[PDB]
Amino acid sequence: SYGLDLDCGVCFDPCQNYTLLDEPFRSTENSAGSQGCDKNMSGWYRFVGEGGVRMSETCVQVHRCQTDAPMWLNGTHPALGDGITNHTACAHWSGNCCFWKTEVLVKACPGGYHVYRLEGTPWCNLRYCTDPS
Ligand SMILES: *[C@@H]1O[C@H](CO)[C@@H](O)[C@H](O)[C@H]1NC(C)=O
Numbered sequence: 001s002y003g004l005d006l007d008c009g010v011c012f013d014p015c016q017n018y019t020l021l022d023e024p025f026r027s028t029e030n031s032a033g034s035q036g037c038d039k040n041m042s043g044w045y046r047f048v049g050e051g052g053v054r055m056s057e058t059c060v061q062v063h064r065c066q067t068d069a070p071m072w073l074n075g076t077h078p079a080l081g082d083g084i085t086n087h088t089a090c091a092h093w094s095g096n097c098c099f100w101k102t103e104v105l106v107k108a109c110p111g112g113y114h115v116y117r118l119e120g121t122p123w124c125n126l127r128y129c130t131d132p133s
């Protein structure tokens with residue numbers, strides 16, 4: 001269970017307890033590499049580095065982000081003060097920009113970053129992309 005500002009899974013502020021990922025291969029512009037899968041993700045994550053600091057809000061082309069079906073945010077990012085928000089993540093595959101979908105949580109944080117709660121993936125090979133733009 002999570003609330004407006006804290007996640008209880010005891011309760012903590014996601015902006016102060018997340019996993020930091022600096023993985024440029026996650027970029028929506030990276031179409032290379034051996035496809036991997038974010039099946040092992042759990043809890044809250046922050047993305048930094050040249051691959052970008054945010055999930056894409058637009059459908060990503062297949063075979064990007066070092067995966068087969070790249071996953072993007074079927075929603076709009078929250079602002080600081082909006083609390084933890086409920087969103088759908090969509091995987092693009094086989095002509096279908098939401099071939100698979102799963103729930104993700106998003107929170108805006110003091111200091112100008114977002115954190116994402118990512119609980120595995122619905123299929124493999126799927127990954128949560130970052131937009132370097
Ligand atoms: C951070 O989150 C992890 C997993 O949710 C938990 O095991 C750990 O106790 C948390 N730490 C703090 C300080 O909240």
Ligand SMILES: *[C@@H]1O[C@H](CO)[C@@H](O)[C@H](O)[C@H]1NC(C)=O
Pocket residue numbers: 074075076
């Ligand atoms: C998700 O994407 C579809 C198609 O691109 C769009 O119609 C819908 O409004 C989007 N939902 C949100 C919450 O952004």
Ligand SMILES: *[C@@H]1O[C@H](CO)[C@@H](O)[C@H](O)[C@H]1NC(C)=O
Pocket residue numbers: 086087103
């Ligand atoms: C997010 O919203 C969906 C649709 O209302 C719901 O099924 C899901 O349980 C929500 N996630 C939560 C409350 O963590």
